[PDB]
Ligand binder design. Structure first.
Ligand SMILES: [Cl-]
Ligand SMILES: [Mn+2]
Ligand SMILES: [Mn+2]
Ligand SMILES: [O]
Length: 219
């Protein structure tokens, strides 16, 4: 039964299961070791319904399965698909949020504090991604991953802090749902936020659930 499998393994094996877990606000990225059963119980969800939704998704194999891919290919993919994108996405969202918080300051639904939280995420993620690209990822490419417990534990602590920031961003934005009086800039910014959350969760998932454990295992 899918409920007895870890969230991370389900997300990495079933196409769009990541999107299903995002719908249910289950942390498959930094909390990807927990079983679906445990995650669903904490959130008081009907786990049979979720198993049926996963079964329908699992009719196809995942288009690209990273679980057994070479660690160097995973690293190069992370840098181009996630690190480079975050470095473009977040400055753009910071400026959009600034504009929304000023233009709609008088409105009740305006996401006050959003700029602040995006800025914190950008600063913390920027420094973090530089340390991966300059220290940890080269160490893994050199074959020293089995010696990386310390560095990986530091990176995984930052992942938890990034997850905390994501929760604050989601709360500030009514789970990234714009109000009815949202103009196009506001709505477009929320689409960008959802894209950032989707990407960052898949990115952390690939590191926590594939790259880091396999590196430590000597692969
Ligand atoms: Cl969860
Ligand atoms: Mn990374
Ligand atoms: Mn990372
Ligand atoms: O990251």
């Amino acid at each position: 039964a899918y409920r007895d499998q870890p969230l991370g393994e389900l997300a990495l094996s079933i196409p769009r299961a990541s999107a299903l877990f995002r719908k249910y606000d289950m942390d498959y990225a930094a909390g990807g070791k927990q079983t679906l059963a445990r995650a669903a119980a904490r959130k008081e969800l009907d786990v049979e319904v979720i198993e049926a939704e996963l079964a329908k998704l699992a009719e196809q194999p995942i288009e690209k399965d990273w679980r057994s891919a070479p660690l160097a290919e995973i690293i190069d993919h992370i840098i181009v698909r996630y690190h480079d994108r975050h470095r473009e996405q977040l400055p753009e969202l910071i400026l959009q949020a600034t504009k929304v918080e000023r233009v709609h300051a008088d409105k009740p639904s305006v996401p006050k504090g959003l700029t602040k939280y995006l800025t914190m995420l950008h600063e913390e993620l920027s420094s973090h991604m530089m340390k991966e690209e300059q220290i940890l990822f080269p160490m893994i490419k050199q074959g020293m991953g089995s010696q990386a417990m310390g560095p990986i534990s530091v990176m995984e602590s930052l992942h938890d802090e990034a997850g905390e920031l994501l929760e604050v961003i989601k709360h500030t934005t009514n789970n990234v749902t714009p109000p009815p009086e949202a103009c196009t800039t506001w709505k477009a910014m929320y689409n960008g936020i959802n894209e950032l959350i989707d990407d960052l969760m898949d990115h952390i998932s690939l590191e926590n659930n594939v790259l880091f454990p396999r590196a430590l295992a000597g692969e």
